[PDB]
Design a protein around this ligand. Structure first.
Ligand SMILES: [Ca+2]
Ligand SMILES: [Ca+2]
Ligand SMILES: [Ca+2]
Length: 86
């Protein structure tokens, strides 16, 4: 994987990566799909307790995407969003 994403992903513990993967998997047909849609991305993030704004989701999609989000792109968006807690 990409090494920048590697700068985001190193922030996560193994418990975190596994918890996030179980949540992401709810939103794909495991047997046939690697990506969630941009509408599902807000849903998965909220399922992990994040509350991104729609303007945020668009920005993140613009900046992170290498319409759709695979697991490593999702991890980077999670890491980004986890840092805007107050
Ligand atoms: Ca945990
Ligand atoms: Ca656990
Ligand atoms: Ca759990």
């Amino acid at each position: 994987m990409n090494d920048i994403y590697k700068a985001a992903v190193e922030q996560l513990t193994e418990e975190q990566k596994n918890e996030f993967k179980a949540a992401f998997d709810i939103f794909i047909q495991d047997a046939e799909d690697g990506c969630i849609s941009t509408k599902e991305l807000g849903k998965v993030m909220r399922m992990l307790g994040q509350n991104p704004t729609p303007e945020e989701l668009q920005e993140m999609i613009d900046e992170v995407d290498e319409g759709t989000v695979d697991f490593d792109e999702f991890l980077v968006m999670m890491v980004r969003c986890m840092k805007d807690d107050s």
